[PDB]
Amino acid sequence: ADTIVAVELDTYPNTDIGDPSYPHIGIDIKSVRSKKTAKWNMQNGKVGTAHIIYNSVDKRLSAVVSYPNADSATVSYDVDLDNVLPEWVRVGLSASTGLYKETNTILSWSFTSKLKSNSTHETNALHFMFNQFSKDQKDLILQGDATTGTDGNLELTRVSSNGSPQGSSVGRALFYAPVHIWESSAVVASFEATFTFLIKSPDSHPADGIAFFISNIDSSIPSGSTGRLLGLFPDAN
């Protein structure tokens, strides 16, 4: 059904579906079983920043995640996205909770896509930046439990009044406009995404994670993708 390319900030180690034994960042190409992962020293309650970059010349999707005053984690994977995704895609953020939970709060999100064609000076670009989300954010498609406006933030999963994260929740936010990532006369296509997040859990084992993803434009949350599936995959294959 959906084609998903995602960079996951996986807070819970589901070693039975291939997660390493620690929080990790991973690159998922059409499967929750990451093609590549890197240990991530996740800090409960701290605001982190994730940067994702890719260009069609190098064909390497790379991500860097850091927290202030801490060393960063980085993961890269060689993948030609022209062979995985459609030429028009939607980009978004997804997060879930299962039996274990955490807040999956997004405080800001920026994205820049550029397609440079062979005509002298031909650049097609799309750029958006959100440093605040309003209750009626018309340029975002919110799916599942995702809501905007509480403290001007984007809450991907359900958080009750007293700020408590709820389990078995899943939510996604996609930018409204389709994004053009391939065009026949493009000599270089590239994108960069950055988002700051705040994962906080009352528990010692937060779950399940946040993911930046690119999908077919009409992507919707797969049935039963709460928990370990991060609101992105229908199963764990």
19 binds Co ion (CB under 5 A): yes
The rounded distance, in Å, linking the Cα atoms of 215 and 134 is: 24
Residues within window 140-199 making contact with a second copy, judged by CB under 8 A? 152, 175-180, 183, 185, 187-188, 190, 194, 196
10 binds Co ion (CB under 5 A): yes
155 binds Co ion (CB under 5 A): no
φ and ψ at residue 114, rounded to 5 degrees:
-140, 140
Instruction: State yes or no: 208 annotated in a binding site.
Output: yes
Residues within window 7-46 making contact with Ca ion, judged by CB under 5 A? 10, 12, 14, 19
Identify residue 46 by its one-letter amino acid code. K
Least distance in angstroms from the C-beta of 230 to Ca ion: 8
Least distance in angstroms from the C-beta of 99 to Ca ion: 12
Least distance in angstroms from the C-beta of 122 to a second copy: 4
Only segment of 23-31, 107-115, 158-166, 200-208 that touches Co ion (CB under 5 A): 23-31
Instruction: State yes or no: 2 annotated in a binding site.
Output: no
Q: Of 94, 50, 57, 92, which is closest to residue 74 (Cα–Cα)?
A: 50
Residue corresponding to tokens 């709820």: 166
Among 45, 99, 125, 224, which residue interacts with a second copy (rule: CB under 8 A)?
125
Asked if 194 contacts 174 with a C-beta cutoff of 8 angstroms, the reply is no
- Number of other CB atoms surrounding residue 203 within 10 Å: 12
Q: Of 153, 108, 160, which is closest to residue 134 (Cα–Cα)?
A: 153
The rounded distance, in Å, linking the Cα atoms of 87 and 29 is: 16
**81 or 170: whose CB is closer to Ca ion?**
170
Helix (H, G, I), strand (E, B) or coil at 120: coil
φ and ψ at residue 139, rounded to 5 degrees:
-95, 15
20 binds a second copy (CB under 8 A): no
* Residue 12 binding target from Co ion, Ca ion, a second copy, none, CB below 5 to 8 Å by type: Ca ion
Asked if 169 contacts 145 with a C-beta cutoff of 8 angstroms, the reply is yes
Among 80, 124, 164, 166, which residue interacts with a second copy (rule: CB under 8 A)?
124
Interface with Ca ion by CB under 5 A: which residues? 10, 12, 14, 19, 228
Residues at the annotated binding site for a carbohydrate?
Answer: 208, 228
